[PDB]
């Protein structure tokens, strides 16, 4: 029908709404950039051992969801960041333990995936097989929520080189 309203946007020209969510909060603000703060810390998500940028809008995304007071005493830095973010931007740097690992998916010549994981710092190397591999770098463990990879073929180019569309999707716990 022409009266139906879809849920997630595809490629057609249309306006859609998402299902009514409850376990989510938002905040808005405009950066002032009068005096920028900085400091090391410990969080979820974020590229380790590299200076990021934090404003009042993306601090919920680049720095991940807030931690939990029950899980030890690692909840301090996110509270401190929130406390001092309503005035200006930031330059927080994240540090992670030695046993932290990030997922990686490696593909063979025939195209068969092979799941794997690797610790940080160490570079990724490929053996005699396993033509190419693709790994995440945001640092999220991808356990809550989960991120899936979908590969579909597409039209070739003028020179005849094969091209395939790569899609990264996130699945919430509920099922959306």
């Amino acid at each position: 029908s022409q009266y139906s309203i879809q849920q997630s946007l595809g490629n057609a020209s249309g306006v859609a709404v998402s299902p009514i969510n409850a376990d989510a909060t938002l905040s808005t603000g405009v950066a002032l950039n009068s005096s920028l703060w900085a400091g090391i810390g410990v969080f979820a998500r974020g590229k380790p051992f590299t200076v990021l940028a934090v404003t009042e809008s993306n601090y919920e995304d680049v720095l991940g969801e807030p931690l939990k007071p029950s899980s030890g005493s690692q909840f301090e830095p996110i509270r401190h960041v929130y406390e001092a973010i309503q005035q200006t931007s930031g330059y927080v740097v994240r540090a992670v333990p030695d046993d932290a690992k990030f997922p990686i998916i490696m593909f063979d010549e025939s195209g068969e995936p092979a799941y794997s994981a690797l610790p940080y710092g160490s570079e990724i190397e490929l053996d005699s097989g396993e033509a190419f591999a693709i790994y995440v770098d945001d640092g999220d463990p991808c356990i809550s929520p989960t991120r899936e990879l979908t590969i579909e073929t597409a039209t070739a180019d003028s020179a005849g080189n094969e091209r395939f569309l790569l899609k990264l999707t996130q699945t919430t716990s509920l099922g959306v």
């Binding site: 029908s1 022409q2 139906s4 299902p19």
Partner: protein, 176 residues
């Protein structure tokens, strides 16, 4: 004897009424009339003539048995209702008790962002009324705007003055 309505029609291809409106039988019947339609053969029409006839009655009209209706008919009717280009902000049960029809209606109301008012068979006793709801399949986290009613009561009909039992969607929609 009561006369419904009369009009001047012609079997010619381009016969025009004195007011400029068309008089070709298919166009004339399909334009201004509300009860009848006609189909004309395209090869014998030129030499075809008519006569005077009195009291030509219809014989053979019969709708069959309305008590038993196949589920496919309900599905087709629901699909037709889904494509109707109109504003409607509530889908009522209107008496259907087939589970597939109710599931399709639930799919309808979660697509146009409206709210349904379905129900279950009033003859079911209180014990077996509860399993019927999850037998419908509405229960879940997707059909979040519908509602199910039960009404095991016998009233006095407005027309036949008999003891009849019917559902409860109408009163709920009247309240809304």
């Amino acid at each position: 004897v009561t006369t419904l309505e009369t009009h001047t029609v012609s079997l010619a291809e381009e016969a025009k009424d004195d007011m400029g409106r068309l008089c070709y039988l298919p166009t004339a019947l399909e334009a201004r009339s509300k009860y009848l339609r006609a189909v004309v053969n395209e090869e014998l029409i030129s030499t075809a003539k008519v006569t005077n006839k009195k009291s030509l009655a219809f014989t053979g009209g019969t709708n069959g048995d309305q008590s038993k209706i196949s589920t496919a008919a309900y599905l087709r009717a629901v699909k037709v209702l889904n494509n109707a280009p109109y504003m409607y902000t509530a889908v009522l049960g209107l008496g259907c008790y087939d589970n597939a029809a109710i599931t399709a209606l639930g799919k309808i109301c979660a697509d146009r962002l409206i709210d349904g008012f379905f129900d279950v068979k009033p003859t079911l006793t209180y014990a077996e009324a509860l399993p019927a709801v999850e037998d419908t399949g509405l229960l879940g986290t997707d059909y979040v705007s519908c509602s199910v009613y039960h009404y095991p009561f016998s009233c006095k009909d407005k027309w036949t003055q008999s003891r009849v039992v019917f559902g409860l969607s109408g009163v709920a929609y009247a309240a809304k």
